[PDB]
Design an enzyme around this catalytic site. Structure first.
Site, PDB file in Angstrom:
ATOM      1  N   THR A   1       0.889  -1.201   0.000  1.00 30.98           N
ATOM      2  CA  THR A   1       0.000   0.000   0.000  1.00 30.98           C
ATOM      3  C   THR A   1       0.902   1.218   0.000  1.00 30.98           C
ATOM      4  O   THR A   1       1.990   1.184   0.592  1.00 30.98           O
ATOM      5  CB  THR A   1      -0.885  -0.004   1.276  1.00 30.98           C
ATOM      6  OG1 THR A   1      -1.690  -1.189   1.242  1.00 30.98           O
ATOM      7  CG2 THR A   1      -1.858   1.195   1.337  1.00 30.98           C
ATOM      8  N   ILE A  20      -2.596  -2.834  -4.154  1.00 32.36           N
ATOM      9  CA  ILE A  20      -2.913  -4.068  -4.869  1.00 32.36           C
ATOM     10  C   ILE A  20      -3.122  -5.187  -3.843  1.00 32.36           C
ATOM     11  O   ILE A  20      -3.340  -6.348  -4.193  1.00 32.36           O
ATOM     12  CB  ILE A  20      -1.790  -4.467  -5.841  1.00 32.36           C
ATOM     13  CG1 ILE A  20      -0.443  -4.502  -5.115  1.00 32.36           C
ATOM     14  CG2 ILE A  20      -1.740  -3.508  -7.020  1.00 32.36           C
ATOM     15  CD1 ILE A  20       0.681  -5.086  -5.943  1.00 32.36           C
ATOM     16  N   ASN A  21      -3.048  -4.801  -2.574  1.00 30.61           N
ATOM     17  CA  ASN A  21      -3.207  -5.687  -1.395  1.00 30.61           C
ATOM     18  C   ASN A  21      -1.888  -6.345  -0.951  1.00 30.61           C
ATOM     19  O   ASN A  21      -1.007  -5.620  -0.512  1.00 30.61           O
ATOM     20  CB  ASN A  21      -4.398  -6.662  -1.447  1.00 30.61           C
ATOM     21  CG  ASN A  21      -4.682  -7.268  -0.073  1.00 30.61           C
ATOM     22  OD1 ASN A  21      -4.324  -6.656   0.962  1.00 30.61           O
ATOM     23  ND2 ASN A  21      -5.314  -8.442  -0.030  1.00 30.61           N
ATOM     24  N   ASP A  43      -9.463  -9.255   0.902  1.00 31.91           N
ATOM     25  CA  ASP A  43      -9.953  -8.324   1.927  1.00 31.91           C
ATOM     26  C   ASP A  43     -11.399  -8.542   2.318  1.00 31.91           C
ATOM     27  O   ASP A  43     -11.856  -7.937   3.296  1.00 31.91           O
ATOM     28  CB  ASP A  43      -9.725  -6.860   1.522  1.00 31.91           C
ATOM     29  CG  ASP A  43      -8.321  -6.340   1.912  1.00 31.91           C
ATOM     30  OD1 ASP A  43      -7.542  -7.045   2.615  1.00 31.91           O
ATOM     31  OD2 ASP A  43      -8.036  -5.174   1.564  1.00 31.91           O
ATOM     32  N   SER A  71     -11.847  -1.861   3.763  1.00 30.55           N
ATOM     33  CA  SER A  71     -10.420  -1.454   3.693  1.00 30.55           C
ATOM     34  C   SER A  71     -10.018  -0.751   4.982  1.00 30.55           C
ATOM     35  O   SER A  71     -10.848  -0.116   5.624  1.00 30.55           O
ATOM     36  CB  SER A  71     -10.276  -0.418   2.574  1.00 30.55           C
ATOM     37  OG  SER A  71      -8.934   0.019   2.432  1.00 30.55           O
TER      38      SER A  71
HETATM   39 CL   LIG Z   1       3.409   4.657   1.682  1.00 33.52          CL
END
Ligand SMILES: [Cl-]
Ligand SMILES: *[C@@H]1O[C@H](CO)[C@@H](O)[C@H](O)[C@H]1NC(C)=O
Ligand SMILES: *[C@@H]1O[C@H](CO)[C@@H](O)[C@H](O)[C@H]1NC(C)=O
Ligand SMILES: *[C@@H]1O[C@H](CO)[C@@H](O)[C@H](O)[C@H]1NC(C)=O
Ligand SMILES: *[C@@H]1O[C@H](CO)[C@@H](O)[C@H](O)[C@H]1NC(C)=O
Ligand SMILES: *[C@@H]1O[C@H](CO)[C@@H](O)[C@H](O)[C@H]1NC(C)=O
Ligand SMILES: *[C@@H]1O[C@H](CO)[C@@H](O)[C@H](O)[C@H]1NC(C)=O
Ligand SMILES: [Cl-]
Ligand code: NA
Lengths: 189, 342
Positions: A1, A20-21, A43, A71
């Site tokens: 992230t 993109i997880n 997620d 999220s």
């Molecule tokens: Cl960052």
């Protein structure tokens, strides 16, 4: 992230967090386009998958077609009563994003730490389940002792807790900081 | 110390901050700079974010004094269903783990609303960087080492992430020549190339070949969403703007609302006695706020109106603060974690 904070010369601002997880997402890279595809479906909660001992799946966050998964991201902008931006902040770090963004805000707004100190200051994390407080390696050990005498179980993070990028308005202009945990540097003029 | 008299970009890679800054200097909006910098982070930290993923932007316009949020997070494909995974490994690796990417639709919407520089200009510096290559940074190096086994045994990944069949190390040059071409197509043809254009069939082919279910219709129908009223809370004489569900703004709001009632100041950390109590109170606020998190979900699919109203209520926060004991933490049940609405 990745979290990015921007303030432009006219005083407008953007706080953006992107993901993109997991590392390299789904591990599916297109040989033609080079695109690396996310694994954001991970997620969602699933009735058949247990992630943490004694924690049930959360039905509010089950998969449906067309639904977005919950999220931990929280790109934030704080604006003063005069309409000028005070702080642009957000973080990477999974469920630690929300606590680390809280800490950066507390550190700057209430404790009076300048932006770089607010970003670099040691952090800690607790998300109720699991039932443990994680503290970073260099936290004030008087804090660790104060938590343990109040019956918190603490454990030291093996690497670090979250990554925060932040900009804060000062008398000097816009003070920016990128987290040394990741090794970024801001830029400006 | 990075104080700047006019403008500033704080990204997690120095070169991407400078790319954002250069966009600002060339007359770009804060949104132009953010997109140009994000495109660069997608290369330098390819393990972390990129055009195969999704994002949220909180944007504030100094002139109108209005904040908005752009929601460009990924969505489950039309063929997805609640029981499609039976193990963590199924949900994490392979094409079936892929949600419909929203990143490029997010950049497009933000740029349509707030852009000043041409779309192609936002991509130019990243296309150069991807072709000339760059030294692997600290974060990417750690991720490559953590995933070495997977990377090294998958030829399509080892194609770019290895040197002589071994993962790249920090300082070694990484080039991303296929992504450079994709970024060039996006710059020339626009966001349409991804969702309903020259890239779309190949995206679907790649996802499905790896066992996924994303179809062209999924990409065609993807929309970023403008949210005109982000979540906000009042802190003193300031307003904090943040995304609501499906992001964690409501959890952040509850943490800060619980804690604002203690009136923390620099004195709160001036002695170990005070500092210890202060950090205890912070941890307890986290525990209260996370108890409520498991009721949250996409508000188009789940009714979260009451949950979010509570989590953003100063009075609800004062009820929770009154339950924080200064001398002890409590068992999990004390914080009333909830999996169904009461
Ligand atoms: Cl960052
Ligand atoms: C999980 O099990 C359900 C019920 O058997 C099935 O519909 C689904 O395809 C399974 N998923 C995988 C990835 O094997
Ligand atoms: C901010 O709002 C003003 C007034 O509507 C507008 O002229 C300007 O284009 C906006 N700036 C951006 C970057 O959207
Ligand atoms: C473009 O859009 C229409 C309907 O959304 C569809 O008929 C066509 O196949 C699309 N093209 C691509 C390349 O996805
Ligand atoms: C904060 O929250 C709501 C928007 O739904 C509204 O009552 C109020 O106008 C907002 N405040 C600001 C400063 O935007
Ligand atoms: C909201 O809070 C009130 C107490 O302040 C409580 O009665 C109610 O159960 C809560 N609603 C939800 C959906 O959590
Ligand atoms: C969690 O930790 C607290 C703190 O000591 C303790 O009271 C409690 O028994 C632990 N276990 C559970 C299930 O809450
Ligand atoms: Cl590539
Ligand atoms: Na700094």
């Amino acid at each position: 992230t990745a979290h990015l904070s921007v303030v432009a010369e006219d005083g407008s601002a953007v706080s953006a967090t992107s993901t993109i997880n997991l590392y390299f997402g789904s591990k599916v890279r297109s040989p033609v386009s080079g695109i690396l595809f996310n694994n954001e479906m991970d997620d969602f909660s699933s009735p058949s998958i247990t992630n943490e001992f004694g924690v049930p799946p959360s039905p509010a966050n089950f998969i449906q077609p067309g639904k977005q998964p919950l999220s931990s991201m929280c790109p934030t902008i704080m604006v003063g009563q005069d309409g000028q931006v005070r702080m642009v902040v957000g973080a990477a770090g999974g469920t630690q994003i929300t606590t680390a963004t809280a800490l950066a805000i507390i550190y700057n707004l209430w404790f009076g730490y300048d932006v770089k100190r607010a970003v670099e200051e040691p952090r800690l994390h607790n998300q109720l389940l699991p039932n443990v407080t994680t503290v970073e390696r260099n936290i004030d050990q008087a804090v660790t002792a104060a938590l343990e005498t109040r019956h918190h179980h603490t454990q030291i993070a093996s690497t670090f807790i979250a990554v925060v990028q932040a900009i804060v308005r000062t008398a000097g202009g816009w003070a920016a900081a990128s987290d040394s945990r990741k090794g970024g540097e801001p830029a400006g003029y | 110390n990075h104080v700047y008299t006019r403008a500033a970009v704080a990204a997690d890679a120095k070169q991407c901050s400078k790319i954002g800054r250069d966009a600002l200097r060339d007359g770009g909006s804060a949104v132009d700079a953010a997109i140009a910098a994000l495109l660069c982070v997608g290369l330098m930290n390819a393990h972390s974010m990129g055009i195969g993923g999704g994002l949220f932007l909180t944007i504030y316009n100094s002139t109108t004094r209005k904040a908005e949020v752009i929601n460009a997070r990924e969505v489950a494909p039309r063929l997805a269903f609640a029981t499609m995974f039976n193990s963590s490994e199924q949900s994490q690796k392979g094409g079936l783990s892929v949600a419909v990417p929203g990143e490029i639709r997010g950049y497009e919407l933000a740029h349509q609303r707030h852009g000043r520089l041409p779309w192609a200009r936002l991509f130019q510096p990243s296309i150069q960087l991807a072709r000339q290559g760059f030294p692997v940074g600290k974060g990417l190096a750690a991720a490559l080492e953590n995933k070495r086994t997977v990377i090294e045994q998958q030829p399509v990944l080892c194609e770019v992430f290895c040197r002589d069949r071994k993962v790249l190390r920090e300082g070694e040059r990484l080039t991303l020549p296929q992504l450079a071409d994709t970024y060039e197509t996006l710059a020339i043809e626009g966001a349409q190339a991804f969702y309903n254009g020259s890239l779309t069939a190949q995206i679907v082919k790649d996802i499905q070949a790896a066992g996924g279910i994303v179809t062209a219709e999924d990409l065609n129908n993807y929309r970023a969403e403008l949210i005109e009223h982000p979540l906000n809370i009042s802190l003193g004489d300031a307003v904090l703007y943040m995304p609501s569900a499906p992001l964690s703004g409501p959890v952040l709001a509850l943490i800060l609302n619980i804690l604002k009632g203690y009136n923390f100041s620099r004195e709160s950390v001036e002695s170990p006695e005070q500092k210890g109590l202060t950090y205890h109170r912070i941890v307890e606020a986290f525990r209260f706020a996370y108890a409520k998190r498991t009721l949250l979900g996409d508000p188009k699919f789940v009714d979260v109106t009451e949950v979010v109203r509570n989590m953003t209520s100063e009075f609800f926060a004062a009820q929770l603060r009154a339950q924080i004991s200064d001398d002890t933490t409590h068992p999990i049940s004390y914080y009333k974690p909830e999996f169904y609405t009461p």
